[PDB]
Amino acid sequence: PAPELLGGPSVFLFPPKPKDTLMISRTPEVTCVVVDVSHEDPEVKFNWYVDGVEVHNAKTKPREEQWNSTYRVVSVLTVLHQDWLNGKEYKCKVSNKALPAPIEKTISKAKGQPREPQVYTLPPSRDELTKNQVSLTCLVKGFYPSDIAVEWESNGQPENNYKTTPPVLDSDGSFFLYSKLTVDKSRWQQGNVFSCSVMHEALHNHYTQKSLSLS
Amino acid sequence: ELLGGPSVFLFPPKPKDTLMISRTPEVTCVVVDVSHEDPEVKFNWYVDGVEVHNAKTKPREEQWNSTYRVVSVLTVLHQDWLNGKEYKCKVSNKALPAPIEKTISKAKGQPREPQVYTLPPSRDELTKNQVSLTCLVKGFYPSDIAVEWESNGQPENNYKTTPPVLDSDGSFFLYSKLTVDKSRWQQGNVFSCSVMHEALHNHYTQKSLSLS
Ligand SMILES: *[C@@H]1O[C@H](CO)[C@@H](O[C@@H]2O[C@H](CO)[C@@H](O[C@@H]3O[C@H](CO[C@H]4O[C@H](CO)[C@@H](O)[C@H](O)[C@@H]4O[C@@H]4O[C@H](CO)[C@@H](O[C@@H]5O[C@H](CO)[C@H](O)[C@H](O)[C@H]5O)[C@H](O)[C@H]4NC(C)=O)[C@@H](O)[C@H](O[C@H]4O[C@H](CO)[C@@H](O)[C@H](O)[C@@H]4O[C@@H]4O[C@H](CO)[C@@H](O)[C@H](O)[C@H]4NC(C)=O)[C@@H]3O)[C@H](O)[C@H]2NC(C)=O)[C@H](O)[C@H]1NC(C)=O
Ligand SMILES: *[C@@H]1O[C@H](CO)[C@@H](O[C@@H]2O[C@H](CO)[C@@H](O[C@@H]3O[C@H](CO[C@H]4O[C@H](CO)[C@@H](O)[C@H](O)[C@@H]4O[C@@H]4O[C@H](CO)[C@@H](O)[C@H](O)[C@H]4NC(C)=O)[C@@H](O)[C@H](O[C@H]4O[C@H](CO)[C@@H](O)[C@H](O)[C@@H]4O[C@@H]4O[C@H](CO)[C@@H](O)[C@H](O)[C@H]4NC(C)=O)[C@@H]3O)[C@H](O)[C@H]2NC(C)=O)[C@H](O)[C@H]1NC(C)=O
Ligand SMILES: [Cl-]
């Protein structure tokens, strides 16, 4: 059955994916999400502002039934790459009948001097070579803001069998992370060059790439 | 949902404490939003269902927001927690229509032995004043672990360890990074990544790393 929701809906406002802001070929988005919307008063009205000035290009998604008999209602505003990076503030305003006033939320990029990531690749431990799979390692560090993207490639083709860590606040107020790519030991032993690819605003052309292979 | 009354939060012990026998692990039961009007709080502590006493409860402390906070701390037997015994805090108070019960215990699932490998700095980094010594730990379960860096029997200062990340096989890995001055590296001192996990012989293993 439906819960009581005495407080009405609530808003959450997410930023663009870091890759999207950085590659001009891609489409960056802010995403305003309203939850705890009732069946009785399910209309949500959205107003979007950039640095105070209103914009109308938002896309209006259909509402979605959740497991608790409330609606999840989203508006999505595409944005320009330079604006976000320049730190324009993106304000979502939400108006629903079950509230006494509109709820406003804002999101900009983190403030603070951006810092270039230093990218280092590290081969497998001597002790891991007994295993059938090995761990190739990419360390990204001394970067700010935390917004970053990392993938792997070999010989022109993407390698997808990796996991990257969340960024970690280092002790000089920069961030670091480790990505780890698991590959078959043969592909390593054959002499194939794998590559860490890192994307971040402080990097030249938002892109750098370190390679790594048997020696 | 329970609306209008004190609230209860139950905390597990530090992993490092559950593992080493020299240390004393504790389950901590915090009660907040206790009024001055009804400030008396009764703690009942159950193990697997068996009521237990010997929990050391501290006197209530006045909070900035003018509520009271109260804490009861159960000491736990290292073995008990690992064998996975359930721990229960029952909080009674007049303001509460019915008393509040919380339970916690070690995460369920088959324990799995971490592997630990140490990675010297990348050649590229040998340019810098400081450098990164990297300890990769993976294949472990549950996610509760403890990782430290050492040299000459003493803990190293400037290191940071990522949170556990869930690998594709249902195990976790992390990475721990130690920073040092290059000189210490090249004069070829020795550094040690220590790891404490439930599923290692003596809940401990360490691996060294030195210039070569
Ligand atoms: C008046 O003022 C009061 C104080 O200012 C204020 O009290 C606060 O009320 C908050 C709620 O209203 C309460 O918020 C909870 O916070 C939980 C996390 O608390 C820890 O982390 C905080 C920092 O982030 C610390 O400040 C806290 O003190 C606490 O820190 C931990 O403390 C323990 C014990 O002290 C300690 O463990 C012990 O360590 C020692 C070492 O000395 C020993 O080794 C012992 O062995 C060991 O036990 C920890 O080290 C320490 N951790 C630190 C410092 O990091 C948070 O978990 C709660 O969130 C959950 O529940 C809410 C429901 O409210 C959910 O909305 C939320 O999503 C979380 O939900 C849970 O998630 C689980 C995991 O995902 C999930 O499995 C569960 O299903 C789910 N539900 C649960 C568990 O029910 C919550 O936010 C805050 O702690 C209170 N502050 C204090 C100091 O108690 C009060 O509100 C004010 N009142 C008014 C009216 O204004
Ligand atoms: C009924 O049913 C509903 C369906 O489940 C349920 O909805 C859920 O409601 C909760 C709130 O109760 C809401 O939780 C919030 O989640 C935020 C993160 O959401 C992410 O990640 C989760 C999983 O991690 C996803 O499921 C979400 O969908 C969302 O995914 C992102 O979505 C966007 C848009 O699609 C994508 O672009 C992203 O890629 C995608 N991410 C991922 C990983 O997939 C979380 O941030 C919120 O926490 C903050 O507010 C809390 C308030 O409850 C604070 O306690 C908490 O501290 C956080 O505070 C913030 O802290 C920041 C950093 O520390 C600060 O910078 C901020 O200033 C500060 N902000 C605030 C507001 O405090 C929050 O936990 C779920 O998102 C939501 N489910 C969905 C699907 O949206 C209803 O609640 C149910 N209700 C009832 C009554 O039963
Ligand atoms: Cl905790």
Swiss-Prot record, chain A:
GO biological process: adaptive immune response; antibacterial humoral response; antibody-dependent cellular cytotoxicity; B cell receptor signaling pathway; complement activation, classical pathway; complement-dependent cytotoxicity
Region annotation (CH3) ranges: 112-215
Domain of life: Eukaryota
Domain Ig-like: residue ranges: 9-108, 117-213
Extracellular domain ranges by topology: 1-215
Disease the record associates with this protein: Multiple myeloma: A malignant tumor of plasma cells usually arising in the bone marrow and characterized by diffuse involvement of the skeletal system, hyperglobulinemia, Bence-Jones proteinuria and anemia. Complications of multiple myeloma are bone pain, hypercalcemia, renal failure and spinal cord compression. The aberrant antibodies that are produced lead to impaired humoral immunity and patients have a high prevalence of infection. Amyloidosis may develop in some patients.
Protein name: Immunoglobulin heavy constant gamma 1
Organism the protein comes from: Homo sapiens (Human)
Shown residues within the full chain: 113 to 327 of 399
